[PDB]
Amino acid sequence: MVEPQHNVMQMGGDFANNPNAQQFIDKMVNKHGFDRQQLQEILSQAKRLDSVLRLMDNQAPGPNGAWLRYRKKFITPDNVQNGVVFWNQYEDALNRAWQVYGVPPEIIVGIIGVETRWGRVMGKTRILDALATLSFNYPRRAEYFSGELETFLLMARDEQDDPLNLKGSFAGAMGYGQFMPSSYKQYAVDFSGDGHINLWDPVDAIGSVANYFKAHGWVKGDQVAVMANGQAPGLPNGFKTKYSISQLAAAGLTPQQPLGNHQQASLLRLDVGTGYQYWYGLPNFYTITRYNHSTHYAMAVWQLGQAVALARVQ
Numbered sequence: 001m002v003e004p005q006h007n008v009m010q011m012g013g014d015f016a017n018n019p020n021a022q023q024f025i026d027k028m029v030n031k032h033g034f035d036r037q038q039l040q041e042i043l044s045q046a047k048r049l050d051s052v053l054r055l056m057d058n059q060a061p062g063p064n065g066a067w068l069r070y071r072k073k074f075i076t077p078d079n080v081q082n083g084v085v086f087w088n089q090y091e092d093a094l095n096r097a098w099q100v101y102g103v104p105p106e107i108i109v110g111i112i113g114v115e116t117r118w119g120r121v122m123g124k125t126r127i128l129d130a131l132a133t134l135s136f137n138y139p140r141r142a143e144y145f146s147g148e149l150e151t152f153l154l155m156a157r158d159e160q161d162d163p164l165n166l167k168g169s170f171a172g173a174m175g176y177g178q179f180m181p182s183s184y185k186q187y188a189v190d191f192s193g194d195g196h197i198n199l200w201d202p203v204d205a206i207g208s209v210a211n212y213f214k215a216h217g218w219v220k221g222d223q224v225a226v227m228a229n230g231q232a233p234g235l236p237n238g239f240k241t242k243y244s245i246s247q248l249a250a251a252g253l254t255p256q257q258p259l260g261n262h263q264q265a266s267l268l269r270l271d272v273g274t275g276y277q278y279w280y281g282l283p284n285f286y287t288i289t290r291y292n293h294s295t296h297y298a299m300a301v302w303q304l305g306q307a308v309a310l311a312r313v314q
């Protein structure tokens with residue numbers, strides 16, 4: 001009946017003679033009470049995906065219209081129209097997310113839109129393959145991904161999912177909002193109320209994105225960014241920059257909208273082909289970058305959300 005298989009200490013597959021996989025199994029058994037043989041069966045099926053390693057390497061750390069090209073990948077009639085459909089379909093969850101977390105529908109709709117086109121593109125790679133590959137055959141970020149794999153397996157166990165059935169991005173991101181295992185653990189919420197946190201349930205995803213935003217400092221009703229009149233070619237730009245409003249004014253900029261009580265801001269510069277468009281980046285813009293560290297990403301999420309909000313009014 002019961003087969004302990006104590007003598008089966010060697011697994012097959014792509015990670016068969018991998019020291020990192022062996023150490024990982026030992027950690028899961030010692031730290032979390034996993035059964036070595038059960039874990040060996042799972043990992044013997046895990047695949048080493050060279051494409052994952054190559055993409056992770058390809059992303060390792062004008063005016064020619066850079067922003068225009070990025071923007072048009074997300075802000076198109078088809079995308080905006082689909083965003084309207086998603087918003088209307090899940091309006092109750094979105095409104096409830098606004099009330100509980102203070103994060104507006106346009107922001108959540110923009111995030112889910114840029115991330116997966118509202119569930120249309122959620123990834124085709126088995127999460128286990130991606131995470132095992134990055135944990136066992138990628139020294140540069142082996143520690144970060146081993147932590148993600150550990151959390152992934154714990155998530156599967158708790159939510160009673162088969163670790164091998166879940167698919168997502170090349171980095172192991174999952175569902176509507178493309179949450180990493182660590183984000184599921186720290187920020188995902190059962191917004192649908194059925195007692196289970198499912199990253200593939202749009203209602204849960206909506207609440208999880210909102211909670212993620214509030215946890216990262218989103219200020220309800222605060223401005224995201226304000227476009228500037230003027231140019232500031234001398235000053236370095238990017239979402240990580242920081243200047244007092246006085247410095248920016250001295251550099252030749254004026255806000256198109258009142259900045260209120262804000263005394264500092266980041267200097268954002270968008271390449272609009274004919275020249276540059278400067279913006280005063282406010283705290284909420286930086287909060288968007290906490291989801292994906294990119295000025296273009298944050299601006300696309302925000303503007304996509306605004307475009308959908310407007311298409312809804314019509």
Ligand SMILES: N[C@H](CCC(=O)O)C(=O)O
Nearest residue numbers: 056059060061140141293
């Ligand atoms: N994506 C991270 C970027 C690290 C960073 O520059 O903060 C990596 O590949 O390590």
Ligand SMILES: N[C@H](CCC(=O)O)C(=O)O
Nearest residue numbers: 066067069070294296297
């Ligand atoms: N899509 C980005 C480039 C676009 C941009 O952010 O300017 C990439 O894969 O590198």
Ligand SMILES: [Ca+2]
Nearest residue numbers: 190192194196
């Ligand atoms: Ca749920």
